[PDB]
């Protein structure tokens, strides 16, 4: 019935396409389970046991990471006034009852998952790799740390279960390679970025000894250079220069001048060269995916020939299109995509390809002809029952009007529900979830499991969706209505005048899962050096707290006394929005300004990241949308 | 001995090199003035009487265009407590007497440039060119308004006064064809931008009216459209929603993932768009550069040929190089040159030359050999005097060591300064004046006065250079000596780790006049509506003023209450640098939510040409000096 548990047959014919087909998708096979005489030994079976069962690592990766909010803070233990909550967290810390009882579920699934591939590689291999040369070490790390907080220094295990978590996932590791090959080029950028505010601190600092301003503020040199920093940020621009604004007017002629060549040049040339350098980052990532299908598609060639001269049959290749389990036609579809397919020289009547020759009809069946469909019928012994009776279902599903009246029902669905809100005031709040778990638990069996995975964003729904029935088992409901009509507007990207713009923003949902999540991962680093740098400060009792700004404006709870809360106040840092009260708080609170390169270590980092894997990468992949919007309109007028 | 001067003899082979000339630098001729039979009339003597005269004009629309800030307010008269300086400005007020002085000087030579090219147009092409109507339009609004002040309404002059001066000037005008190009997409998706906050100030207005923040900011929707709005810029980040942050912490997961959405994709997305339309507006223009191009050459190709056959010959191509007086030796380099350019008729062998085939001629010599210098000799008195002893000066000049020895003593200019500082401690100060004028007067007679205005940036100090030596005469002096070294960091830019970055960003210094001084219009526009719209409510003895945000964060000195104060007041506006202590202060000054709508109309405005015309100009032109760096050496090495 089905096409996925077959690498034990895997015959001339049976299992060469599905090389053929991991091209398509480009899922990984490692180069030595390519290497292989037979490359389908038995330990290919285990291979393919990994990624059948992936999703269970991400109930531990995620898992993982996730447990670092979950913790203690680091000095409860020195401290008076435990438990007053003097602005801390809301979430639980897990005692060590708690504690360690997490941990186990987690180093078990870390050894199963990195003790994993000496399944299918050799010990001089695995232990050679210097990516897992990496992951083996981190895991030891954690692998004592348990240990040791059982029987019961700084505790550095929770640096480590970010870089486990970053290597884990091929998104966020392909995406830090990017910062090997971008960061030679933005630190060589970053040292004329820096003499920008050196030149500058000096003149402003030279330029205002005599004035009012040298009495009030600038009265260190570095205290120049500290406050001209946070101008080329502005988000301190009039109240740096109000002394100098206050007593002559033409000092703000000055200061106009350097916020300007400061934010819309600079920083629009610190992002010319960071949007430059991942141009070419990207396609030598991407360019180093293809050789990965060359080094895929030379194994689906090597695969056929037995004399290996050089060269397969029209025949020879129509029986792979016989074995390709084919659309509906194989007439002339070869014959047809002869000159179609860019170059034949057609020296040989029809037997004429060569090992480049093929690499184009793989892509060309998965970019124009869209072939293959993997149906997945059941586990053997409910099949019959079901196969027979799902073709009274699946008649009715994948018709397309009821596809469509998939989309037009679901229009219904959230109405009932702002009239309910209501009338239920004038459980009964779970009754509401029967309706909502009902329409998806449908074309899960017209898709198949991994087909619905295929899919956009409903792949994110189903996310969304079993939690919801999970957290109902231990009114949010009204605001989880909102995620329906937030499909709705995948119905305004149809329209011409605002195609390209949600053509990319509904692309974009997917594209930054990992360059947005690397952004997470430094939060999770730089929180956790908060929490053990910048802990206990901020406390009810300290006097020295109540006189700066984060008691005058109330930042009282966008605090690092923990770990969550650290991490929103990292978040802050990362929009620039008053980002300066906790900079000219901390070099209060810890008392000397060593705390101050904290803060610009956050800025120089983050201003890569930002500039980098966001912002750039938009700019990028808008114009994939733009051209493929053009080019469908011109190849669909020119041939 | 010169080439200035020559339109009136022009004869088959003078002035037709300089038809092929007004291709190298693209100068304008108007079409009418290449329509003409002989295109050499007694119209066209006048024609180059313009730009001879040009640079009078900028003591004309510079002189207009500043004289705004000299201006009274609008409403001294009503007032009680007039001459009180209350946080006013610091330039006095031109009064009745010197208000029309300046005036008559203003269109006088407004008149004279208006209605110039009546001297070399038809009354009904001068008076049918609707870019002459509007500029005639604008100045009798002035020409009234002057006679109007003087027989003694809000006083409808200054708003004209920038729409003359964006008019005049070439670079303003050519920029803002693209605003009415850009103007039809940048609005298309302005309504899905402003249907992004709509749609999520909706949510949060809905969800949160049960808790404490509808008890506190979120009472009204339309308070929730004016919050979420500054969200959207996050010059307000967490003051926002302290209150649903304090009571439940889950519902920063809310604002830290619209704002999330906000500023990272959308304001990327709108920046995407802004700076994809500006690339086809951008060539869409250059192309209109180019007809410029060829209906010029179309002159310089039928100026050749008197049987207008549709060829020229070799020698009669040669005999324009000899008439080029731009090269050294010439026997063969069209011969050289045949092939060279990219194709070649040579049907009937040297003499076939289509109307196509003499426009790469032309810029090939401009691009590839450049020989052309224009030397400018004397008037006609003191001419040989001097051009025979200027051959024992300009042996020096023309010597290139010589020429780094202009680079290499002006390393020594500076150093004195320092220690010269303390010590005139221990007038003298106009003495040091002599020294500047004296290094930049050599090199004039060396290169000529446009040939000092056709280098880069050493225009531009000339322009400073002379207002020294008039503000001499009218401590300073000590800021001034930066500029010196401000020319050593040109000497940065051959570092070749350091290159394509400052490749951009002194060649970004003549790039964004135009796309700078549109936005420096901009907000003479918008200060003279804050003049009469908001002038005079921020008193000294206000009492709403004084529990407002202008007075806490003590911004007073902010207002617009004149002009200059309120064209400062734009610059942080401009910045996103705390712009809503403004926007919440005039909402409490006027006392009505109009107010309101000034601020987002800087912001809509202003965040196109912000992220047009500054931001996404400098990606582009960071490519041209980044693949003309590659491609130098490239074809350093290729061909
Ligand atoms: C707080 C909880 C966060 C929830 C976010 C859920 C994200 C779902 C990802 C689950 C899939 C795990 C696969 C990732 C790497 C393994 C292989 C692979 O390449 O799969 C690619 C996967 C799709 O490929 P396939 O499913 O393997 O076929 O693409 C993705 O969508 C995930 C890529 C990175 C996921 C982790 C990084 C982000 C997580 C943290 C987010 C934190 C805040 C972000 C805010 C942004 C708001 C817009
Ligand atoms: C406050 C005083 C501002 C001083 C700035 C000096 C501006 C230089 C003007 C040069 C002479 C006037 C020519 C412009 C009219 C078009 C004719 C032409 O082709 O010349 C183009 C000229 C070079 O071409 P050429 O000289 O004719 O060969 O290019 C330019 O450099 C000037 C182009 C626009 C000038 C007016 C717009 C800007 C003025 C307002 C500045 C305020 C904001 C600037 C802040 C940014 C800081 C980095
Ligand atoms: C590079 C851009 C990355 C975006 C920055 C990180 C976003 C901040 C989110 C974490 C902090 C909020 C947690 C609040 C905990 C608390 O104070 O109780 C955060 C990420 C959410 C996932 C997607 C957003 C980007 C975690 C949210 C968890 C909320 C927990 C609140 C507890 C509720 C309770 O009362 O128990
Ligand atoms: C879109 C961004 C445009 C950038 C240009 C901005 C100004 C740069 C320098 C121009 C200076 C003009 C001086 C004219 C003299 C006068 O009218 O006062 C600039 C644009 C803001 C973005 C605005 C800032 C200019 C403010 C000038 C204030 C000087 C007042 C001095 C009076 C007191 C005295 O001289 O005694
Ligand atoms: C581009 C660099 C040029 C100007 C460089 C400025 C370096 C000055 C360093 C001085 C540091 C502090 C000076 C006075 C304060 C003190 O005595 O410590
Ligand atoms: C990247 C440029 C600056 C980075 C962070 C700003 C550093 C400025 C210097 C800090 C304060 C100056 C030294 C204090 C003087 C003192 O001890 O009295
Ligand atoms: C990689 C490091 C980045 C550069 C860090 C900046 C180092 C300069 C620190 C400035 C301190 C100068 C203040 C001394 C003057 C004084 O205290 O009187
Ligand atoms: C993933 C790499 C980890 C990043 C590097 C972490 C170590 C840098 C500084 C750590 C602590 C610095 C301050 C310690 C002072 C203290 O504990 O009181
Ligand atoms: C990685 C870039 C970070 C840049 C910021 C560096 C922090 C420098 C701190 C400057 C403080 C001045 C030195 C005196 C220290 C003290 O007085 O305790
Ligand atoms: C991607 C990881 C980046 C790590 C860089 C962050 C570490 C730099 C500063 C950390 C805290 C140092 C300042 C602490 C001052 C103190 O000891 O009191
Ligand atoms: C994408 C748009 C969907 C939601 C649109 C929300 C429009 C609601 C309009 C209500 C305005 C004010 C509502 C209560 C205050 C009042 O009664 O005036
Ligand atoms: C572009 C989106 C918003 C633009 C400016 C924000 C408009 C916010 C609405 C004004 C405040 C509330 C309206 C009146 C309420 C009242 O009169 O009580
Ligand atoms: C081109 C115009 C842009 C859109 C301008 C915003 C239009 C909506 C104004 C919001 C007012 C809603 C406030 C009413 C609710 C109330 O006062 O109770
Ligand atoms: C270059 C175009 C000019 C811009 C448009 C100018 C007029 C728009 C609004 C002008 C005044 C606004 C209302 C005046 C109220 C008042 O005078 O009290
Ligand atoms: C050009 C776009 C500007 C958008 C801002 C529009 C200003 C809208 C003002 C909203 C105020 C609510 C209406 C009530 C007026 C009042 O009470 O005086
Ligand atoms: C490029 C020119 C843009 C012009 C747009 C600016 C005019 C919009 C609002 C001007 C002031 C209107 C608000 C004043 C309300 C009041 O009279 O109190
Ligand atoms: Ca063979
Ligand atoms: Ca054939
Ligand atoms: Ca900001
Ligand atoms: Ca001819
Ligand atoms: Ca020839
Ligand atoms: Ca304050």
Same mark, same amino acid.
């Given at each position: 019935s089905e096409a996925i548990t077959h690498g034990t047959p895997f015959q001339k014919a049976a299992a060469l396409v599905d090389l053929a /087909? $991991? #091209?398509? +998708? !480009?899922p990984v096979e490692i180069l030595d389970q390519s290497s292989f +005489? /037979? &490359?389908?030994?038995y330990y290919f079976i285990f291979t393919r046991l990994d990624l059948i069962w992936s999703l269970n690592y991400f109930a531990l990766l995620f898992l993982n990471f996730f447990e670092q909010p979950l913790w203690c803070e680091k000095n409860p233990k020195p401290s008076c006034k435990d438990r007053d909550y003097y602005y801390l967290g809301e979430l639980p810390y897990l005692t060590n009852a708690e504690s360690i009882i997490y941990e186990v579920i987690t180093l078990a699934i870390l050894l199963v998952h990195t003790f994993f591939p000496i399944s299918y590689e050799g010990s001089r291999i695995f232990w050679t790799s210097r990516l897992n040369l990496v992951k083996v070490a981190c895991v030891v790390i954690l692998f004592v740390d348990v240990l040791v907080d059982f029987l019961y220094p700084f505790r550095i295990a929770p640096y480590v279960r970010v870089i486990i978590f970053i290597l884990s996932i091929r998104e966020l590791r392909d995406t830090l390679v990017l910062l090997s090959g971008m960061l030679g080029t933005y630190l060589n950028i970053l040292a004329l970025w820096m003499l920008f505010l050196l030149f500058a601190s000096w003149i402003a600092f030279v330029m205002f000894e005599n004035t009012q301003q040298g009495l009030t503020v600038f009265t260190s040199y570095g205290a120049t250079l500290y406050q001209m920093f946070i101008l080329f940020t502005t988000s301190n621009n009039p109240d740096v220069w109000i002394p100098a604004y206050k007593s002559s007017r033409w000092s703000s002629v000055f200061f106009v001048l350097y916020v300007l060549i400061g934010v819309y040049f600079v920083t629009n040339l610190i992002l010319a060269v960071v949007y430059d350098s991942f141009k070419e980052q990207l396609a030598k990532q991407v360019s180093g995916m293809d050789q990965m299908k060359r080094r895929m598609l030379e194994k689906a060639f090597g695969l056929i020939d037995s004399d290996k001269n050089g060269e397969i049959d029209k025949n020879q290749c129509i029986k792979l299109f016989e074995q390709l389990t084919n659309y509906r036609t194989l007439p002339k579809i070869s014959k047809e995509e002869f000159g179609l397919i860019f170059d034949e020289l057609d020296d040989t009547r029809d037997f004429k390809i060569n090992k480049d020759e093929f690499a184009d009809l793989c892509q060309a069946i998965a970019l124009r002809f869209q072939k293959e469909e993997v149906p997945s019928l059941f586990e053997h012994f409910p099949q019959i029952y079901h196969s027979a009776l799902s073709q009274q279902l699946r008649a009715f599903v994948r018709s397309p009007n009821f596809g469509y009246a998939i989309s037009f029902i679901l229009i219904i669905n959230?109405?009932?529900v702002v009239v309910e809100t209501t009338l239920n005031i004038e459980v009964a709040e779970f009754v509401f979830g029967w309706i909502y778990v009902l329409e998806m638990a449908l074309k899960i069996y017209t898709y198949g499991f991994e087909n619905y995975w295929r899919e956009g964003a409903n792949r994110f729904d189903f996310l969304v969706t079993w939690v919801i029935v999970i957290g109902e088992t231990a009114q949010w409901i009204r605001y989880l209505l909102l995620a329906r009509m937030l499909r709705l507007i995948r119905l305004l990207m149809n329209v011409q005048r605002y195609r390209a713009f949600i053509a990319t923003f509904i692309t974009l949902i997917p594209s930054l899962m990992p360059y947005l999540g690397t952004i997470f991962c430094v939060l999770c680093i730089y929180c956790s050096i908060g929490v053990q %740098?910048? #802990? +206990? !400060? %901020?406390?009810? #009792? =300290?006097?020295?707290?109540?006189?700066?700004e984060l008691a005058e404006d109330d930042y !009282? !709870?966008? =605090?690092?006394? $923990?770990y969550p809360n650290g991490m929103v106040t990292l978040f802050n840092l990362l929009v620039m929005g008053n980002w300066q009260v906790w900079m000219e708080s901390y070099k209060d609170l810890? #008392?000397? @300004? @060593? &705390?101050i390169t904290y803060f610009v270590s956050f800025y120089v980092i983050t201003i890569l990241l930002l500039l980098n894997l966001v912002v750039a990468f938009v700019l990028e992949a808008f114009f994939t949308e733009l051209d493929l919007e053009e080019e469908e309109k011109c190849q669909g007028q020119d041939s």
């Open positions: /087909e $991991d #091209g398509i +998708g !480009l +005489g /037979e &490359s389908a030994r959230f109405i009932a %740098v910048f #802990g +206990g !400060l %901020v406390n009810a #009792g =300290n006097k020295k707290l109540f006189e700066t !009282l !709870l966008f =605090n690092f006394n $923990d810890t #008392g000397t @300004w @060593w &705390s």
